[PDB]
Structures are given as structure tokens and as C-alpha cells.
Amino acid sequence: KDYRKKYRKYVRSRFQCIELNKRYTRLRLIKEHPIKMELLFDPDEPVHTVVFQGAAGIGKTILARKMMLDWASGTLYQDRFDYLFYIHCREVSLVTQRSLGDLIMSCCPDPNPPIHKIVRKPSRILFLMDGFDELQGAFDEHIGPLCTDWQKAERGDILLSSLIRKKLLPEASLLITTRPVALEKLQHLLDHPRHVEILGFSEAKRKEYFFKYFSDEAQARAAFSLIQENEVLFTMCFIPLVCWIVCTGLKQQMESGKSLAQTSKTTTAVYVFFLSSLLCAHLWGLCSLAADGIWNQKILFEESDLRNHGLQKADVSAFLRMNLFQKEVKFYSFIHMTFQEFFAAMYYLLEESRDVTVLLENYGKFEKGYLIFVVRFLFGLVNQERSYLEKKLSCKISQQIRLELLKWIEVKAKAKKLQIQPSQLELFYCLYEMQEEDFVQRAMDYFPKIEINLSTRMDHMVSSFCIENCHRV
Numbered sequence: 001k002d003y004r005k006k007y008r009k010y011v012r013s014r015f016q017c018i019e020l021n022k023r024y025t026r027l028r029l030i031k032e033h034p035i036k037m038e039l040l041f042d043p044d045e046p047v048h049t050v051v052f053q054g055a056a057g058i059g060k061t062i063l064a065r066k067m068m069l070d071w072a073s074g075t076l077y078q079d080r081f082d083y084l085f086y087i088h089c090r091e092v093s094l095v096t097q098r099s100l101g102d103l104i105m106s107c108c109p110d111p112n113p114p115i116h117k118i119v120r121k122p123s124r125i126l127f128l129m130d131g132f133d134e135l136q137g138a139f140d141e142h143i144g145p146l147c148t149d150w151q152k153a154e155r156g157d158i159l160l161s162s163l164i165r166k167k168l169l170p171e172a173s174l175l176i177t178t179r180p181v182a183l184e185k186l187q188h189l190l191d192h193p194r195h196v197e198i199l200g201f202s203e204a205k206r207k208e209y210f211f212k213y214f215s216d217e218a219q220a221r222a223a224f225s226l227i228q229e230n231e232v233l234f235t236m237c238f239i240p241l242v243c244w245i246v247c248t249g250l251k252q253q254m255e256s257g258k259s260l261a262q263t264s265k266t267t268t269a270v271y272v273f274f275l276s277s278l279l280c281a282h283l284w285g286l287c288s289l290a291a292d293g294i295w296n297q298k299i300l301f302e303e304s305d306l307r308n309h310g311l312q313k314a315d316v317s318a319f320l321r322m323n324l325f326q327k328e329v330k331f332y333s334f335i336h337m338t339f340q341e342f343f344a345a346m347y348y349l350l351e352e353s354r355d356v357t358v359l360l361e362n363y364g365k366f367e368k369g370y371l372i373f374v375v376r377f378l379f380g381l382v383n384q385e386r387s388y389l390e391k392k393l394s395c396k397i398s399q400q401i402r403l404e405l406l407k408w409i410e411v412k413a414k415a416k417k418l419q420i421q422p423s424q425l426e427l428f429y430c431l432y433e434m435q436e437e438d439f440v441q442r443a444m445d446y447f448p449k450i451e452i453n454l455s456t457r458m459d460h461m462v463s464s465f466c467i468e469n470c471h472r473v
């Protein structure tokens with residue numbers, strides 16, 4: 001345990017704040033579809049593979065980092081593990097060749113760590129695979145041949161396919177967080193996995209977060225009230241990212257005299273609500289970036305990367321960094337993947353914006369990025385009656401794109417469901433964004449018979465909005 005102490009200290013160092021350790025709200029977990037974190041690995045004969053289905057922005061990354069902090073502070077798995085390695089998939093190549101040791105040695109504080117004494121005992125090692133989806137580039141069952149040597153340098157996709165199929169440190173423990181969609185690629189790999197669902201806050205712990213954001217007990221009460229009276233923002237705030245998006249927007253209108261109000265009905269109109277809360281001159285550049293980034297599988301941007309797309313004289317430094325960027329290690333990423341997809345979407349709808357027919361030929365593909373929010377938003381945006389920023393929008397070029405989205409929904413509504421995505425519900429979400437009734441009802445035609453997969457009460461809404469638009473008398 002000479003080095004174990006040094007390693008644990010380093011882990012407390014990196015994982016002590018989300019991006020201190022204070023505003024964390026207990027997210028809801030459900031096994032076999034309420035599990036204590038410690039009890040996860042315990043047998044039903046022990047477990048070597050856990051997977052957290054997590055919706056984007058539900059705090060899967062935070063919940064991970066917390067497990068790291070708690071263990072790194074002796075709170076949980078003191079007895080079960082000697083080492084927890086946090087792998088941020090976002091960062092790791094899938095083409096680069098590397099060894100399990102090379103990948104491991106990066107997790108460590110010092111430069112030449114005792115790697116051979118770490119692997120000594122793998123039954124005491126847990127890898128935290130954070131955002132299996134955030135992996136950039138293709139991934140397919142086809143990949144081979146599978147590796148069996150930790151010291152051997154395969155290219156990332158092989159190496160991980162080998163680690164996940166438990167061929168590399170078989171009796172390692174492994175905890176993968178992932179988006180629901182990316183479960184299709186990953187389901188086959190898993191060695192007898194234990195599935196867990198991150199659900200986000202409850203109604204209670206929805207309250208809890210507001211009074212953890214709002215320093216003043218009154219400013220907190222007045223700004224949770226909005227969200228009971230509003231229906232969308234209540235349903236919509238079981239999700240933590242929204243909660244933040246919402247309360248960072250209730251805080252400069254907490255600055256101004258504007259008696260608090262957000263009458264937002266759609267996800268797009270909440271992003272755009274918050275997007276405006278932080279307000280132009282370099283607007284074109286951001287959207288330029290995100291849409292090369294999504295297309296070219298880059299979630300992390302270097303300074304150099306930035307100077308090309310725009311900010312030729314220190315725009316990012318002041319204008320954007322405040323709330324729309326995060327700096328990692330010298331490299332920069334958007335405060336969330338979604339906001340990237342947004343500007344990537346929003347990039348196709350502006351004053352002189354590329355070809356849209358391209359995007360749709362490959363919707364729901366892993367390697368080009370799922371493009372869930374790429375699509376989903378630019379229905380809620382292209383919407384004619386849906387602002388101020390509405391200006392930067394090209395009024396004329398909008399119903400260029402609006403007229404093909406309907407061609408593509410039509411295709412997808414009544415096929416043999418060749419592709420998995422879009423599952424009907426996603427099209428409903430596309431449709432609840434594109435709030436224009438006439439467009440919705442017309443699309444509703446194309447569905448012969450509908451099919452519901454309702455988990456949460458947000459699902460219930462988006463669905464039950466579209467249902468009545470269906471009727472053809």
C-alpha cells in the first residue's frame with residue numbers, strides 16, 4: 001500500500017469539485033430495469049460488469065466522479081477495491097494504438113508508476129468507463145482479433161473491445177456509463193452485465209437542487225415556484241442539466257428587475273431561453289465549429305482549432321469561456337455535448353449552412369455521432385413562430401429544410417424499421433419540438449399504427465401532445 005496512498009491522494013485532488021463537492025443531489029437509480037451504490041457489485045457468484053443506462057445530461061459523469069471521491073475518501077468500496085481508474089471516453093482514441101498499461105499509466109499522477117504491481121491483483125481494480133457513447137468514430141462487433149495481453153498495444157477500439165468482453169483482466173470490475181441509444185452497439189460485448197438506470201431527481205430532490213443553487217432561501221423559493229406553475233419545466237426538471245440550464249437563466253433576471261418568468265414549452269425554447277440569458281459578433285464561428293466537430297468526431301478543441309473557425313482576436317478568452325466552454329488538462333470542450341449538437345443544428349439555419357440531405361442519410365449511426373439533438377432541435381428551431389436571436393436566423397432558408405424533415409419522417413414512419421433509430425418516440429420528440437400544429441398533424445398521417453415506450457412523465461407529455469394532433473375526423 002506504499003503507492004496506494006499516493007494514488008488515493010491524487011484521486012481526491014482531481015475529483016474534489018464537479019468541474020467544490022457540495023451541490024451534488026442524489027440521482028435516482030433503479031436495478032433490474034432502489035440500489036445503494038455500495039450494493040452494486042454484491043452477488044445475487046460476484047459481478048464483474050455494471051452498466052448505467054444514462055440519458056444525456058442526467059449526471060452520469062457527476063455520479064461517477066462522486067463514486068471516485070467517496071471511494072478516494074474511503075467512504076465506499078474500501079474493502080472491495082484497491083484502485084479505481086476513471087476513463088473519460090470523450091478523450092480516448094479508437095484508432096491510436098496503445099496498451100492497457102499505457103491507457104492505465106495515464107490515469108496516474110507520476111510519470112513512471114509501478115504498473116506491474118498495479119496489475120499484480122486485478123480482482124481489486126475497477127475501471128470507470130464514462131460515456132461509452134462519447135467515443136469518437138466507428139465501433140462494430142466486427143473488430144478483431146481480441147487482445148489477451150495488458151502490456152500489448154492494440155488500437156483503442158480493439159483494446160476496449162477486449163477489456164469490455166473481459167478478455168483483458170477478466171476478474172477486473174468495470175462500470176460503464178452510456179446513453180440509451182449507444183446500448184445497441186454495446187449490448188453484445190457485455191460479459192453478464194448488471195443493468196442500472198440513472199433516472200435523475202425526484203420531485204423532492206428537484207426542490208433540493210434549487211435550494212442548493214440559490215444562496216438566498218427566498219430567491220430559491222420564488223424560482224422553484226415558477227416550475228410548479230409551469231408544467232413543462234416541472235416534468236422537464238427531473239433531468240439535472242436542464243435544472244442548471246434553468247437556474248443559470250433565473251439568475252441574471254435575478255440580476256435585472258424583471259419579476260421572474262420563463263414561459264417555455266419546448267427543450268429548444270429552454271436552450272434558446274438560457275442561450276439569450278448569456279448575451280453575437282462571433283456567433284457564426286461557434287456554429288461553424290460544432291458542425292465540423294460533430295461531423296469530424298471532435299468533442300475536444302485545441303486553441304489552434306479555435307483560431308481557424310473564428311475568435312481571431314481573443315473572443316473565446318472572455319465572451320464564451322464564462323458559461324459556454326470548459327478547458328481540459330490546454331484543450332477546450334462545450335459545457336455539454338448537447339450545446340455542441342445545438343450549434344451544429346443551429347449552423348444549418350442562419351444568415352449567409354450546409355446540405356441537410358446528408359445528415360439524414362446517416363441518422364442513428366454510431367460513428368458520425370447519433371445526431372439525436374442535431375435533428376431534434378432544428379425542428380424546434382426551423383419552427384416559424386419560434387425570438388430576438390430569431391434575427392440571426394435566415395427567415396427564407398428555414399422552410400428550405402422544414403419541407404424535407406417531413407419527407408424523412410414519412411420514410412421512417414412506415415418502413416420495416418430497417419434502422420433502430422428513430423424509434424417512433426424520438427419522432428414524437430422531434431414533433432413536440434416542432435410545435436407547429438399543421439406540420440405535426442400532417443406527419444401524424446404517415447403513422448399507420450403508433451407504439452408507446454413510456455418510462456418517465458416527460459415521455460408521457462411529448463407523446464400525449466402528438467396523439468390528439470393525429471385525428472383525421
Ligand SMILES: CC(C)(O)c1csc(S(=O)(=O)NC(=O)Nc2c(-c3cccc(Cl)c3Cl)ccc3c2CCC3)c1
Nearest residue numbers: 055056057179180181239242267338372423425426456
Ligand atoms: C427515445 C430516444 C431513443 O429518442 C431517447 C431516449 S433517451 C435519449 S438521449 O440519450 O438523447 N437523452 C435525452 O434526450 N435526454 C433529454 C431528454 C429525454 C428525452 C427522451 C427520453 C429521456 Cl429519458 C430524456 Cl431524459 C429530454 C430533455 C433533455 C434531454 C437532455 C437535454 C434536455 C433518446
Ligand SMILES: Nc1ncnc2c1ncn2[C@@H]1O[C@H](COP(=O)(O)OP(=O)(O)O)[C@@H](O)[C@H]1O
Nearest residue numbers: 023024025056057058059060061062240241244
Ligand atoms: N447529482 C447532481 N447534482 C448536481 N448537479 C448535477 C448532478 N448530476 C448532474 N448535474 C448537472 O448536470 C450537468 C451535466 O451532467 P453530466 O454528468 O456531465 O452529464 P452527462 O454525463 O450525461 O453528459 C453538470 O454540469 C451539473 O450541473
